[PDB]
Amino acid sequence: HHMEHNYFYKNSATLKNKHGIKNPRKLYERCAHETAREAVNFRLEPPPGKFDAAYLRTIHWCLFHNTFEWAGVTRDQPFTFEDGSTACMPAMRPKGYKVPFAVGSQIQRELKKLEQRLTAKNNLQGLSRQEFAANAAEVFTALDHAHPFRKGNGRTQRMFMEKLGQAAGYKIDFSLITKERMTYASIEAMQHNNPEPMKDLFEDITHPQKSLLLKEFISQ
Ligand SMILES: [Br-]
Ligand SMILES: [Cl-]
């Protein structure tokens, strides 16, 4: 427990970061700006053969390394800052209460089980738009629950979905959807055992690209 605090500046609830910012809202704004810039290039990268914990670490590093020393490192892992201090957070405990996200080494076991399900399904390549959306919703819910990093989980997870989609010929567009909707769908699937909303959300954000790109390509 005592190591949790070493993610933050002394006497503050602000995450240590490479910009030196000590206001948590301003940190958020700068972090949003830096990761948006990095996501533009990461979208053009070729996809790996496995969608696993190493790939998630790769995404997290690529998106957050300008902001966080521990970019690419999961929160179950002791991390030592340049300042000498060592941080980790095996359990999310807001206000001292347990919330139902993966704890400790459960993070790695959940990500493993997710790679194994995806690998066995050829990473969802060769499926209809609807069937892809229905599986992709389940993947998204698995990642919600894993919450592998200290911070940056949402953007990391969305990017993982974009790349899985892209490798299957689909644009996954989270800009189509409101925050309130994503929260509703996440809680339904995680707390109320109700997959339908996340399924309907993925049907709304999964758009076939193969044919459009081929048209564009030939016109050019
Ligand atoms: Br982003
Ligand atoms: Cl400090």
Residue numbers in the entry: 0 to 219
What did the authors write?
Proteins containing a FIC domain catalyze AMPylation and other post-translational modifications (PTMs). Among these, Bartonella effector proteins (Beps) comprise a particularly diverse ensemble of FIC domains that subvert various host cellular functions. The FIC fold comprises eight conserved α-helices and encompasses a characteristic active site loop between helices α4 and α5 that forms most of the catalytic center and the substrate binding pocket. Additionally, FIC domains generally contain a β-hairpin between helix α2 and helix α3 that is referred to as the “flap” and mediates docking of a target segment in extended conformation via β-strand augmentation.
